[model samples]
Target: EPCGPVPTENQLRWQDMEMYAFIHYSLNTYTDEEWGYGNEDPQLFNPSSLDCRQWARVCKQAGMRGIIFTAKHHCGFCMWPSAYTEYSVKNSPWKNGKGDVVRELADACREEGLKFAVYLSPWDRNHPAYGQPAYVAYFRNQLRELLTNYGEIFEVWFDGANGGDGWYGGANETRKIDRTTYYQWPETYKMIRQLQPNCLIWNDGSDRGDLRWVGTEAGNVGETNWSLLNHDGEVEWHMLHYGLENGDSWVPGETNTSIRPGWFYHDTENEHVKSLSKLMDTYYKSVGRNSTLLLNFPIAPNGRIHPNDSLRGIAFKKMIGEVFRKNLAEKARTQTKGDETVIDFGKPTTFNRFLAEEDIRYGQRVKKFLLEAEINGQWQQLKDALVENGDGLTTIGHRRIICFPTVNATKLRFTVVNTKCEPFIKKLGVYLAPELTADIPDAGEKKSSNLHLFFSSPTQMMIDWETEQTITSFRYLPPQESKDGTVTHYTLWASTDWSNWTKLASGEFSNVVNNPIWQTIKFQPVRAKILKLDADRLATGNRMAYGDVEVNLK
Candidate 1:
């Protein structure tokens, strides 16, 4: 059955485009430290060499389509002078309080014909009003300024990096300490819809209106799509990435990695730019694999894409263009007959032969070839096979068919099913052969190591453990629920092994309410030998679905 409506135009397509650049510039850039929650001196916000055009030029030359800038970070410093607060560029040394870095970025993107986006951190360590009702209002007003001030934004990024405890400001006792009711997400989402109708919103939570994200920035497309847990069962949502993959598919991937070691600019990391080859590899894996690549190009303390980074980015782009220059369909012509048509084997079938011109490196070896056929309405089994190797034409078996062939069909295709020998696929003639075989080794049956936990509704399941030994950490694989929910709160319980359980530490979701959604919570195991989880009950009916849960040992 049809799952839902097709993705919107603004929705990212993994194969159509290849590159995106990320700019991590804010008050933190000037301070040369990691966490700059508004405590940074506005005077330090000077960038002697700030130039957004140059930055855009570098990206454009690299064939990048868009740029995402850090308008605000955990430090709560605004790149623009927001009338709502004093901790912004207004007090910075640049332009004597008249300059707007975000504005400059927007203008540069517009002039360069590039898509623009913003990354606004939800955790504001510098805001005195954070967690307070007033802060919510402040946050909304600030967002309005961004939405209204920027001409056309493509994406809005939110990070769940909670820094309220001790770092920015101490946790407030008045608000409900549970997972729900902490962060004012409902208000935030509503404001976004009203302000920017075309932009895509990404958060650590479920992708209710848009798409949800898998936790790690790197990894393969999840086996299952976006899903959440509810009281009755699991729910799913749309998924998107800002990284890279190998094949082209609708679930577009975006790969984003910082050029420097840290997200924010630090003097110590000035020399850590990613090499051009590394960047090219990222492009191949991301854009080539039907994914988008976002490379973090943090503005240096001097207020520019570090010269070293700019040069490296240029080289990386050149390399990518050079590697993937051929079209996959340009090599052949086809004609169809009633039942079947013969394809003159255009090239020789042998090891070390390049089948396609773009197979420049000849990376993989072809071990087996399959001639798939279909007759009447059903697929007909393979009748005969042949292999052309250095030794000349050889007869093969009928078990090597990999794909089905069609009769009076719309399309006929040839594919290499398996490969074991290096430099497979000779460059000269057609080769058909039997599938390769290997001896099997005896092995014992194994039990599953994957942990499975289910929830009825939006309830939290707390798994307790008892142990005398100190535990190192834990990892949780959230269930493939396709609804709107989150792991709201996860408290690490520990003991000796799995018997005596004691509360170690816990983290609560900032803002969550209602039910019928599923979320997975993962965190470092609390200090104890035994690791267990105390999941805050989700809203009634919002059962937390989970799977493949594991605890790492010290």
Candidate 2:
């Protein structure tokens, strides 16, 4: 018997996609703001070498199953030449006021055999009638244009960041609206269903959609994830991070994070593209944790993926292929009864990676389990099983990939220690993955070629250079497992002598909590033999933590 809510056929198809690309290219790419103000001139939107084919090719080679193009972000700049709006690529100087980014991307995706999706932000900062009912009609018109024109869209994404300070048709004021009642999502959803029956809606607004965001944009989901959420009620961050196990609705999680620090391109962020190690961690946490991965690529100003990001993406794809190239247990024989199963490898085999899955059509049931190997005719539990996952060996929903120290075994035993119901194990796999060391590539314009030094647990610390050193920037990377201890606000002080300290820089690391990456703080060059840092506030708890810290002389 089915124990809980099950996914719709469309939802199941979407879940199979596993990994996809998110392209965040807009006026924000040119204006150097994550959320662009509405007042920027349309002439500023010029991309000399914009190539949608290159975008699709890179994504295809990177093992991404689809591309979710940002047709219109919050700035209200449409990528397509919409018949109703002048604020679009139709007026931009990209191709003598004649280019349509959406059409090109859609065609390219079709050509490459990849699924195409669109992200249409409901909150328009540029439109004058955004806060009123009139904007809803305009929004619907835009949606109609996208759905009717773009062959077939697999998913439609709606961002939660809405109704904030914007240009507002030169009003230059903040506007607020009831997120729940403003758009009337039911009508919008109905229109979408009529236009594209198979399209999956992804909304973070008041109304529930087919999918839910996995709370943070820091490239990971909760270890114990459930593809269930209530149809109505307050959807808090906690609920988004880890879905309700007993919720009435079946809405899976989609984990979104940017390749660069920001969703839009910045010249300064070329070296900061997500390292290979970080990308792998993102894969393990998102797709490996039963949630789909919606990895973002901030398109460069010239209108293509950055070279560094492109190469790294290909490298990530190759590494994943190498890691899972062959499953040593593919030829294994298995026998199962009630709560335990044993697999014979046919020969003594060594493995570090373990993959498990559930028959999700029934529902996510397995909660706890024990896996042991028969080594030397004796059963032994896998080593360091709990060290890698702080969340423990729990909740095998759609898929779970567990890694441990490599060990030789001819047979393996899996026991259902605890579960919501009789464990419905669908599949199991074992592999000997290689150790990866190189993360950050060596292709970008970097001031210092030297690797950074790792600093542990630096709540507040002072460093001495042994001599006067001129510095202009400070960089910090939070620990991998850091949650509450991640620094949000800080103040840096420089001192030529121990007694005299001058405040060099003081500010909050915006979006640091959700996007936990290397935070670069630049300031005026100051000569100092020693420097001190004070963490003014954290994202959550009192304990302060740090991963790596460096001072830049450039």
Candidate 3:
């Protein structure tokens, strides 16, 4: 029996994809701005080495199932030559003002056998009549052009970043509108369905769409994710992070994040591609938590994916393949009794990961569950050892993957402690993933430190050591949850007493915001009873913040 809201056919197909690529390239790429003010010249939209085939090939090789191109971003520069507007590629310098990025990318995706999609922003800053009713009709016309011309758009993306400060036909002022009643998304959704019945809609607006954003640009979703939400109601941030378990609609979550720090490319962020550890963590939190991963790749100005991003993306795919290559419990004997299912592995088997899935066509049940392994003839719960896992110990929707420290056991037991109704578990397996040690060069050595801290402050933090200490190196990590107040430039000082201080070093922590990795500063050993570090500059706010600080000494 179906427990609650079930997924539609299209939703099922989409969930199976699990991973895809998002390409954010437009006027913002060349201008080095996140959101263009809509006053830039179209002549600046030129990519010397533009190649859609390269983008498709890279995404295909990275195990991506599709490509969602930014057909039109907030800046209102169309990738394709829209017959309704002259402010598009038809006016750009690329291809001598006769290029269509949307066409090339669409053709390339077809050639690569990948699904194609488009991200069209409704809030057009360049259009003169943006806040009026006339612009709504024009917006619908452009939407029709994209849906009718593109071979087959698998998804249509609509962001909630609506009207604000813009060029506005030389007005150069701010204009606000009721985001709910402005575009009338209901009518637009109807038009889209008429054109492409199989297409899915990802919206962050008032009206519910086929898919939902996971509340943050940072990669990850809530642990107890449900593919259900109210059809037409006010959605709060917490609800978007964790779907309503007892709602009426089947709208799953999509976790979107960038390979680099910003959505668009910048020269400074070239070396800041996400590390394999970071990418893997994202995968576990998103795809492993019943949501799809929409990883963005900011195409460089050279009209190609940066070598660093390509290499890291391919490496990330390779690592995922290596980790889930084989299921260790395939041949195990299984028996279900009451609320528990036990598997006899035939002998002692080692595993560090467990995968669970429900027949989502029936509905996302299983409010709570537990897993235990028999070690030394005693059943031991494995929740305490989870690594790279979420706080979702509740509902298991389409899929849920739990990772923990490696352990050898002869038997495994899965028990359903609570549920909405009779749960239908589709699959279960166990495996041992390979250790990922290449994230940081000396992470292992850094983990062996047994140092104690004394005092800490706001911008400048001081560490008091009772005896004379010889400091050879220092490690500084920025805040993880927010990019605000990240240290950009810093100075380190040492003092024998609190009264006097000697400046030991002063330099910039290059690409700290984009990378957020440990900034290692090494110098000749200096002896001091007290050490202090101060932030000279920050990326966003006034005061500096850090995830951790460490010192390596002789």
Candidate 4:
């Protein structure tokens, strides 16, 4: 229904990047802090064994599409020696004070057939002229260097934190600047587009840049994520974290999380690298749910990803490749008929996972979609009507996955419930999932700072996920302990509209430490707009909650 179906060169390229990494290494790695003061000694900056090739190799093994390095983070430490900065690798002891981390990583990524990206922190705490108009020119000059030096960088990232205390070249004070006008984002964005025509810029809000954030870094998204954003008026973050029900532009979400607790490698979290099971859940919730996942794998101070970190990343990759190696849907006969495009397997077959993809090269067009299966030759909704996701199935960008219990059927059908234009579909992957966890699965570059009431206190965990759920398992640090230790008294409730509610299940969980965190309580899968959990502490009653909160289909 739209005039054209071809995508702009950049959008097409970015849509293909369903998963990648955000390299958050800078002075912070050596400092062992998440953020560094601008005054950190250039001598303190050293990565004697820095190996970009190793970083590339590990990333490629993880099946990542690319890696975006922190060319500059909040501390004003530039990985590459910027012409404007005195505090950089140019002044460090590494390589006898002549090293370019960005250059080397770009080369390594090229060799590994991976796209490279840059995260240039707009918030410069170290600069003497940071909160002034002159800082704008300084920032632009730095951008020019990266654009000119880096070869075809895929993404140029911008963080929204503009004001904070910094060394200010020893000005040593707090600084605050207006976010919109100070950066002159409109002009800055234009400059980026002009310098790197194909690069996708990621800014904070949905309105500013080509990319959007999927609300939480924990990796799960809104049950309905649209590839297009409604530019007409008000904005809501329901679709895959950031999308619209009637979007006019092709802005999608890039879900960023870390394999480790912190974006920068922390010695204390070495053993705490995300489990393969946990990474898998994110795949389901992020890539599986229809948003690209940018997993931040910390580079050790010595400069390569830690051995333990590399192993977990690769394990996560191998599992995905093995599990999704084949798609059963390939055998089905497909055709667009009526509102539903029918896929007939022609014989009884079982599938646990399903994927939908748009030929997004033309941009995200289809808005609402539905899937039904033929049972005993009678078509039926796979799940009960209690949870009608027809409204939530908003965006069909490059990919969207809907997982449920095994359904043996000779025929499967999908209907385009709503659309802005004629539909274009690219990938439809339906498979029987290999049993995995996180395979289903936030935070910033750090652990989830989601600030949910449940985490801060003991429990009215009113989760506004707006989808049905099946899995009731979770992972937390320090494992579990019994206060009056049994999950028996804990209750989980479900609601479609929030007023009326029904108790789904309740059971006693073992007061064990760090084993499987599943409870004996089981219910017939919940299809709700809101989920509220109220109960007594079984162990660590959501207090001191450190990591992710995951839920999924059976």
TM-score of each: 0.57, 0.81, 0.83, 0.77
Residue 278 C-alpha lDDT in model 4:
62
Let me know the TM-score candidate 1 reaches against the reference structure: 0.57
Candidate no. 3 TM-score: 0.83
Q: What overall lDDT, based on C-alpha atoms, would model 3 receive against the true structure?
A: 0.83
Q: Residues 1-554, candidate 2: write the lDDT tens digits.
A: 68788898899899999999999998888877678888778888887789999999988877889999999999998899998789998888888888889999999999999999999998899998889898899999999998999898999999988758889888888999999889999999999999999999998868999999998877778777889999999898878888887889999999999877679996645656777777777888888888988988878889899877888888888878888899877899988877888889988988888888998988878777778988898998863242343535667788888777788999888777777777778888888878766533432222222232112234565666545789888887764554656788888888898764799878887787778789888789999887777788776765455555778885
Error of 2 at 453 (Å): 14
- Model 2 earns a TM-score of 0.81
lDDT winner among the candidates?
Answer: 3
- CA lDDT, every prediction? 0.51, 0.82, 0.83, 0.71
lDDT of 3 by residue, 155-250 (tens): 999888865889977888798988878888899999999999999999986788999999988788888788889998798888889899788999
Ranking by lDDT: 3, 2, 4, 1
- Write candidate 4's Cα lDDT for 1-554 as tens digits: 34223346687668678788888888778877778888877787777687999999998888899999999999898888889878788888899877898999999999999999999998987788888888889999999999988889899998865557898878898987766467887787788888888899887742357877777767666666666565444445464375665556666778888877668987656655777656766787788756788998888888789887777777778778877788988888987877788888889878876788877666667767887888888997753221244434555667877767778888888888877787878777778766653333211122222212232134444565534445443322222222222232456676777684888656444543445454444567666666666545545333322233444445
The worst-scoring run of ten residues by lDDT in candidate 1 lies at 392-401
